[PDB]
């Protein structure tokens, strides 16, 4: 509360560390469905159904331009990528499986780097 604070967690490396995680996600072999924004002209149903599209290249540009106020807003966009994927893609599809795999890969790196 006013003039009463928990001890200050060092957040000075968060930007660098989120960038490294994002690099590792970018270079994963199952990243291909997620590298670029879904083409809203060429994929019927996507625009209407997926209210907030998100992809790795969009996260990379937001990261590089100081549009994440903190590491939690960064995680929320990464998770959005996978939540969108589950919304639109059957579990038993290449893309559906890609999204589960990448979500797992992400959540481990997140825990190991920050928890």
d(CA 78, CA 103): 8
Angle formed at CA 111 by CA 108 and CA 115, multiple of 5 degrees: 170
- CA nearest to 105, candidates 41, 43, 35, 24: 24
- The structure was resolved to a resolution in Å of 1.7
Cα–Cα distance measured from residue 56 to residue 33, given in angstroms and rounded to the nearest whole number: 10
Nearest-angstrom CA–CA distance, 86 and 100: 8
Using CA atoms of 56, 52, 82, 109 in order, give the dihedral in degrees to the nearest 10: 50
What are the residue ranges spanned by the domains of the chain?
1-115
Phi, psi (rounded to 5 degrees) for 10? -75, 110
Contact between residue 52 and residue 2 where contact means Cβ atoms under 8 Å apart: no
Angle between helices 71-88 and 56-64 (to 10 degrees): 160
User: Which fold, 1-115?
Assistant: Histone Acetyltransferase; Chain A (1.20.920)
Contact by Cβ (8 Å): 9, 71: no
């Amino acid at each position: 509360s006013m003039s009463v604070k928990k001890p200050k967690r060092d957040d000075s490396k968060d930007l660098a560390l989120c960038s490294m995680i994002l690099t590792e996600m970018e270079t994963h072999e199952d990243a291909w469905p997620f590298l670029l924004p879904v083409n809203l002209k060429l994929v019927p149903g996507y625009k209407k159904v997926i209210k907030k599209p998100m992809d790795f290249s969009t996260i990379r540009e937001k990261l590089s331009s100081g549009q994440y106020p903190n590491l939690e807003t960064f995680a929320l966009d990464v998770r959005l990528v996978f939540d969108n994927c589950e919304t639109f893609n059957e579990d038993d599809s290449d893309i559906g499986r890609a999204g589960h795999n990448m979500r797992k890969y992400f959540e481990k790196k997140w825990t190991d780097t920050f928890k």
